[PDB]
From a paper:
In siphophage T5, the unique RBP is located at the extremity of a central fiber. FhuA, an outer membrane E. coli iron-ferrichrome transporter, is the bacterial receptor recognized by T5 (25). We present the structures of T5 tail tip, determined by cryo–electron microscopy before and after interaction with its E. coli receptor, FhuA, reconstituted into nanodisc. These structures bring out the important conformational changes undergone by T5 tail tip upon infection, which include bending of T5 central fiber on the side of the tail tip, tail anchoring to the membrane, tail tube opening, and formation of a transmembrane channel.
(D) Cryo-EM structure of the central fiber at 4.2-Å resolution. BHPpb3 C-terminal ~210 residues and pb4 N-terminal ~350 residues were modeled de novo. The proximal region of the central fiber is made of three strings of five consecutive FNIIIs, two at BHPpb3 C terminus and three at pb4 N terminus. After a hinge region, the three pb4 monomers merge to form a 110-Å-long β helix spike, formed of a 24 β strand longitudinal mixed β sheet prism. The spike is decorated with two small globular domains inserted between β strands 15 and 16 of each pb4 subunit and which are connected by relatively long linkers. These domains are not visible in the central fiber map, probably because of the degrees of freedom offered by the linkers. Here, however, pb4 does not have a direct role in perforation or host recognition. The central fiber ends with RBPpb5, but this part of the map is poorly resolved and did not allow building an atomic model of this protein. This 310-Å-long central fiber bears two hinges, one between pb4 last FNIII and the spike and the other at the spike-RBPpb5 interface: It introduces some controlled flexibility to this otherwise rigid assembly and may ease RBPpb5 exploring space and encountering its bacterial receptor.
Numbering used by the authors:
A (entry chain i), B (entry chain h), C (entry chain j): 1 to 464, 626 to 688
The structure:
C-alpha cells in the first residue's frame, strides 16, 4: 500500500508566442521528488524533446522555434521515480492536454510607393507609402541612399505595424527601405528581434511636377485704328486645355518679323508677357509686314520650370476682316497709311481742304469745285502744274506771254477775256494770234481806235494827222483835196484857169477878180 | 487545544485596472486546506461576490467590471473548514484591508478640426486636428470616406493618446474619424479592447484658399506725348488692400471702347497683363474716344484660381490734367492731333515754314512776313487762293488780263506799277481802266510818246508824218501852212496876186519877177 | 548531528534596470526559518545594504539608485539563526555570485534645428529636427511659445527615442523644446519617470524664403521702325543668375524720362509687367529723349514677397546701332522723324512727288526735273517762292508787269519770248527795257509795223496817212512833193512860170496852153 503518486496532470495556463520563442504559463507541482519538465512539440510531422531541470522557475521559454508554423506543445513533470528512458517512452509520466499555438509572422512589406498631389507650384510635401503586412509591437523602418556606395543607414519611423505606413519629410533623392521588428514578452529581460528585410528593388521620390501641354486653337483678330494716325491694334487669342501635365502658369507671347526669321531664327525676336486670360494684344502692329507668332505655355515646378510651345502660326492684318473698329474719330488732320490729308468738319458736310493720296500721287489743296479737282490741287500722275490767282504780284522773271498746250488753238496772247479782233466793244486784245499765225490787236472802240493784224494796221483816227519833227523827202505820193499855206518853194506847177484868192478865199472863187488868164482857149479877159 | 488557525490576513500588493478587468497582485497562503479566494467588490451602493477555485495561480483578473466607476475590492482566502454559507456570511474567514481602484476611462474624442496656413499659392499640407481625452496605450484612429455608401475603413495613426493628435497626408475629400483603444496587462495573453466611438458629425478637409477682394482706389493719369507724332501715353494706377481672402497673385487689366461696349459687353475687349506694382500702362492711347477700364484681381489656389474684379471706371484723356509731359522735343516735322506742320529750328527763333491746322483749315507755306499770313500760305476758310512770284514762266492758257475783287476800283489792267495815265515818267500803262470805265494807255514820255484813252488818242509825234502805201480820196479836210511839190493835177484853184517862184523860192517872194497879175485892182504890171 | 543547513545559494535569474529602480528576478528558498533578503550593492567605491522582510513576494525592486552608474548586486537569504549583527558581517549567510547591471541613461537631447527645402513659392511644410540620444520606451516631447510670459506647455510627439526625431505641422513662431521620459517594468503598477530637460537655448522656426539677387548683364537694343510713321521699337534684355537667395518670380520693368527723374524720383514712372524670358519690349519708344531704365527682380514668399532691383542704366536710341530693322515697307506716304513725304512707287523708279524735310526746311511738290528742285518745290531757307504755269487765270490784282531779281539785266517787260527790239520776226515786245533804261517796243514785222523806244518811235506805215477829225494850226512845217485839191484859201503864194492845168493835168504840163506868164525874163507869150 506504499506508492509514489505521480505529480498531478500538467496544464498550460497561457501561451505567448514570439518569433523564435514561446513563453508558456503553467501550474504548480507536488510529489516531493520532481526534477524538471519534459516538453514535447509537434511540428506537424516531426517531434522534438526538451528538458528544464530546476523547478524554482514558474514559467518556461522554449527557443529555436522553426519559423512560420503552428506547434502543439505538451507539458509534463517528472520525478526521479521515472528515469530518462521512461521519460523518452512517456509512460507513467503524466502529460498535459493538447494545445496548439501560432507563431506570429515576421514583418512583411507588401507595397512601397511615393505619391502626392499633382504639384501646381511651390514646394509640396512628397509622401512615402510603404505597406507592411506582418505583426509586431516595435517595428522599425530604415532608409538608405541608393546613389552612393556607402550610406550609413537611417531609421525614420518606429512604431506599431500598419497596413499602410505613411510619413513625410523624406528627401527627394534615392532611398530604399528595409524592415525590422521585435516582439515583447512578460519576462522583462527577454526580447526577440527579427531579421532584416530589404525591398528587392529601390524606389525614388520625386515631385509630382509634369510638363504641361502647349496651347491650341490659336485665333487672331485686330481693331483697325486708333483715333487718328491709323494705329493698327493686333490682339492674340488662344485656348489652352486641361487634362495632362501640370497646371500651367501664365504664358509668354513671342513673335518675330517674317523677313527676319529667315536670316536668324527665334533669336532677337519680339516677346511680351502674358496674363492668365490666354490673350495678349499688341497695340501698334506693323502694317503689311507679316510676322511669325508663337505662344508659350511656361510651367512652374518646385525646383525649376519647363515650357511647352505651340506650333508657329504666322498672320498679317490687311484690308480683310478687321473687327471692333469704332475708332474713326475725325480730328481735321487724318493721317492714314493710304493717305495723309487735312479736312475741316462742319455740319453734315465734311468739307476737306488738304489731301495727299498714296494711290495716285494726288496732291490737293483748297475746297473742291471741279468734279475731281480743286483750284490749286495737283496730279503729278499725268503731270500738271495747276494754279490760279495771285493777290500780290510785284514781280516776274520771264515774260509769261505765250499760250501753249495747243500749238494752234491756244493763241499766244495777253488780251481782254471775252473780246478780240473784230468786236464792236472798246476792249483790248494783244499778242501772237495763231488762227492767223501772227499778232492781232485792237485798242479802243470800232470807230475811234487802233486796229492791227500781224501784216497790216488800220488806224482810222487823227492827231494834232501830221505832227512834224523833221524834214520829209516823201518817197510816196503826196495827194490832197484842199490846200492852205503861206508860201511855196515848188519845182513845177499846174494852174488850169487863173482865178485869184482875190476871188478864191473871197466868196465864189469866180467872184471879184480883174483878169482871168485861162490858157485853154486864147482867153485873156482884162478888167 | 486543537484548532485550524485560518489562513493569515489577505493583502493586495498591486492593482492594475483595465477597461473591463483588473489584474490584482496578492500574497501567499497557508493552512493546508485552502480552496480558493472570495473577492467582494463595492460598486458604490451594491456588492458582488466571486470565487476563484484553484490556488496554483499567483494573481487574479476580475472581469465584467461596470464601466467608469471606482471599486473597493476585498481579498480573502477560504478553506473547507468554512462552508459556502459562512463564506456568504463572511464571519471567521479572514478579510483584506479596504482598497479602492480606479477604472481608466475609455478613449474620448473632444475636438476634430482641419486647419493649415492661409494658402497663398501651390500645394500645401492640410493638417487634421483631432483631440482625444481618454487614457490607453495602444489607441487606434480610423477614417472613412463619408461620400460613398461603402468605404472600407482606413486606420492612419496608432499610438499613445494625446490632448491633440495631429497628422498630415490626409486626402482633401470627405472623411469621418472613429476612435478605438486597448489596455495592456502584465499577464501576457490577456488584452482588453474598447468599443468603437465615431464622432457624431463628419468633417471635411479643404485647402485654406479663399477668394481675395477686388482692387480699390482706382486712379488715372497720362503722359501727354512722345518725341513727336503726339503719341499719347496712358497709365493706370490702383491700390489693392489686404486683410481678407487669399494673397492675390498678379492682375489683369481689361478695357474696351465706349462705343463698343454698348454693342457687345466685355467680349473681344482689350486686355493686357499686369505686374505686382498694381499699375500698368498703355503707351499709345486713342485720343478723344472714351474707354471702359476694369482691373481684375486674379487669385491662385492649389487646384485652380478665381478672380474678383473691381467696378467699371471709364475715363478719357483730353486737354485737362495731363502730367509728366516733358516729351516735347522739336524735330522739324511736328505731327500733332491739333495740327501737322513743318518748321526749321534756329537759335532762339523757331522759324516755321510748313503748317496745316485742324482748327481753321489753314494751310501755310514759307516764312511769315504778314501778321497772320505768308506769301503762299492759304485759308480755305473765307476761301482765298494766294500766291506770288514765278521764276520760270514760259506758258499761260488764259489771258491773265482782267483785275477783279473790286469791280470798279481794281481796274482791269496790265501796267507799270507806280505810273499811269497822266504821269510825266516814261513808264507804261495798258488795259481796261475802270475809273474811266474804258482803257487808258500811255507809252513813253510826256512829250514824245503815244497817249490813249478808251474814247480818243493823243499821239503828238511825227513819222517819216504821212508815209503812204495807197491812194487817198480824203473824206476830211486837207489843210496846211506851206506846200512844196513837183506838179499838181488839180480841179479848181485860187491865187490872189500872181507872184512867181522866180521870186517865191527866190528870196523875197516880192523879189525878181517880170509881171505881177493881181486880179484885185486892175493891176497888170509888165516888166 | 543536528544542524540548520542555511538556505541554498542565491541566484539572480534576470535583471531589469530602471532610471531609479531595478527589478530583479530570483530563485526560491528553504530552511523553514527565513525572514527576508539582504541585498548588497557596489557603487564602484562605496557599498549600501538593504533588507526585504516578508518572503511571499517573488521578486525585488531596489530604489534610490544613484543615476548613471553600473552597480554590482549581491543576493542573499537569511534566517533567525543569523542575527542582524552577523548579517552585517556576512559570514555564515549564503551569498550570490557577482552580477553587475547597467542603468539606462536619461533621455538626452543632442541637436535641435528647423529645416526644409529652399521655398520657391506658396506654403511649404517647415520640419523640426530634434535629436535625442538617451534610452526609454515612452519618451515625451513638449514645445513652449518663448515669446509670451505664460505659455501652457504643449506636447506634440510621444513615442520611442530616435537618433533624430522629426515631425511637421509646427507653427512658425517661437518654440523651445523640453524632453521627458518613462521606463516600464514587468510589475504592472510600478512606472518610473525622468526629470524634465529643456534645451539651454530656444530655437525659432521660419520659412526658407530668402531675398534673391538683382538682375545683371543689362543689354539694350531696338528695331528701327514699323511699316511707316517711324514707330521706333525698344527691347530690353538682361540676364539674371542663380546660386543665392530664392527662386525669383517674374520681373517688373520700370523706367522714367531723363528730364522727369530730376524733378521727381522713381515716382509716377513708367512701369510694365515682365515675363520669365528676362526680356520685355516697348513697341513705340520716344525718339531722342533719354530715359532711366531699371529692372526689378520681384520675389515671392509664403507670407509676402520682396524685391531686389538692378542698378540704374539709362540709354537712348539714336542713329547709332539699331538692328532687326526690316520694316521699311514703302506705302506712298512715308512719315518719318527726319522728313514727312509722299511718293508714288513704280517699277524700279521710286518716283517721289511730295516732300517735307526737317533738315533744311525744304518743301517739294511734283516730279523733279532740276538737279535739286521741282516746278513748284520750295526752299524757305535762302527763301524763294518758285511756281510756274496756270491753266485757269481769270483774274489778277496787281499788274505783274515789272521784272526783278536783277535791277538792270532782268528788264521789266512783258514780251514774246525769243524776240525783242531789232528782230526781223513779226513777234512783239513791250514793257520797260532796262538795257536802254526805258521802254522798248515793236509790233509786227520789220517793214509794216510800229517800232518804239523809250525816247522816240518809228512807224514806217500809212493809214487811210492823215485822217482828220479837227482843224489844224500847224506848229511845224508842212512840206510835200505833189498836191491835188479843189480850192485853196491861202495867204501868200509862189508860182515861178505860169503853166496851166489846161496843160498840167493834161499830158506834158508844157502842153496845150495859150499864154505862159513867166515872171523871170520879161516873158509874156500870147497864143
Amino acid at each position: 500500500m506504499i506508492s509514489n503518486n505521480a505529480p498531478a496532470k500538467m496544464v498550460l495556463n497561457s501561451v505567448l508566442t514570439g518569433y523564435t520563442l514561446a513563453y508558456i504559463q503553467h501550474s504548480i507541482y507536488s510529489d516531493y521528488d520532481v526534477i524538471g519538465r519534459s516538453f514535447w512539440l509537434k511540428e506537424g510531422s516531426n517531434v522534438t524533446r526538451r528538458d528544464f531541470t530546476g523547478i524554482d522557475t514558474f514559467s518556461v521559454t522554449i527557443n529555436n522555434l522553426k519559423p512560420t508554423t503552428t506547434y502543439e506543445v505538451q507539458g509534463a513533470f517528472y520525478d526521479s521515480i521515472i528515469d530518462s528512458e521512461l521519460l523518452n517512452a512517456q509512460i507513467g509520466i503524466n502529460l498535459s492536454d493538447k494545445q496548439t499555438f501560432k507563431m506570429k509572422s515576421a514583418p512583411r512589406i507588401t507595397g512601397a510607393r511615393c505619391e502626392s498631389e499633382p504639384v501646381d507650384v511651390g514646394v509640396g510635401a512628397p509622401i512615402v507609402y510603404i505597406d507592411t503586412t506582418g505583426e509586431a509591437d516595435y517595428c522599425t523602418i530604415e532608409l538608405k541612399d541608393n546613389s552612393n556606395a556607402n550610406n550609413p543607414w537611417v531609421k525614420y519611423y518606429v512604431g506599431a505595424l500598419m497596413p499602410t505606413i505613411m510619413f513625410g519629410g523624406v528627401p527627394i533623392g534615392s532611398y530604399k527601405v528595409r524592415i525590422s521588428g521585435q516582439i515583447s514578452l512578460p519576462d522583462g529581460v527577454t526580447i526577440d528581434s527579427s531579421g532584416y528585410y530589404e525591398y528587392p528593388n529601390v524606389f525614388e521620390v520625386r515631385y509630382n511636377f509634369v510638363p504641361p501641354a502647349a496651347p491650341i486653337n490659336i485665333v487672331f483678330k485686330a481693331a483697325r485704328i486708333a483715333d487718328g494716325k491709323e494705329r493698327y491694334d493686333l490682339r492674340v487669342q488662344w485656348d489652352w486645355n486641361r487634362g495632362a501635365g501640370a497646371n500651367v502658369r501664365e504664358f509668354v507671347l513671342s513673335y518675330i518679323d517674317s523677313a527676319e526669321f529667315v536670316r536668324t531664327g527665334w533669336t532677337k525676336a519680339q516677346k511680351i508677357n502674358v496674363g492668365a486670360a490666354q490673350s495678349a494684344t499688341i497695340i501698334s502692329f506693323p502694317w503689311k509686314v507679316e510676322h511669325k507668332f508663337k505662344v508659350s505655355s511656361i510651367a512652374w515646378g518646385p525646383d525649376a520650370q519647363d515650357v511647352t510651345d505651340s506650333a508657329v502660326q504666322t498672320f498679317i492684318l490687311n484690308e480683310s476682316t478687321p473687327l471692333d473698329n469704332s475708332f474713326v474719330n475725325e480730328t481735321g488732320i487724318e493721317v492714314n497709311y493710304a493717305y495723309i490729308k487735312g479736312k475741316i468738319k462742319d455740319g453734315s458736310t465734311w468739307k476737306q481742304t488738304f489731301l495727299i493720296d498714296a494711290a495716285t500721287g494726288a496732291i490737293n489743296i483748297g475746297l473742291l469745285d471741279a468734279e475731281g479737282k480743286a483750284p490749286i490741287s495737283f496730279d503729278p500722275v499725268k503731270k500738271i502744274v495747276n494754279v490760279d490767282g495771285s493777290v500780290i504780284t510785284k514781280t516776274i522773271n520771264a515774260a509769261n506771254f505765250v499760250m501753249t498746250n495747243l500749238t494752234g488753238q491756244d493763241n499766244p496772247a495777253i488780251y481782254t477775256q471775252g473780246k478780240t479782233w473784230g468786236d464792236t466793244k472798246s476792249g483790248i486784245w494783244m499778242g501772237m494770234d495763231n488762227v492767223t499765225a501772227k499778232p492781232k490787236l485792237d485798242i479802243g472802240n470800232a470807230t475811234q481806235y487802233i486796229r492791227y493784224d500781224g501784216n497790216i494796221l488800220r488806224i482810222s483816227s487823227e492827231v494834232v494827222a501830221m505832227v512834224l519833227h523833221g524834214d520829209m523827202i516823201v518817197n510816196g505820193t503826196v495827194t490832197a483835196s484842199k490846200i492852205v499855206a503861206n508860201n511855196a518853194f515848188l519845182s513845177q506847177i499846174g494852174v488850169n484857169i487863173i482865178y485869184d484868192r482875190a476871188a478864191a478865199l473871197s466868196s465864189n472863187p469866180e467872184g471879184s477878180y480883174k483878169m482871168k488868164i485861162d490858157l485853154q482857149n486864147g482867153y485873156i479877159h482884162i478888167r
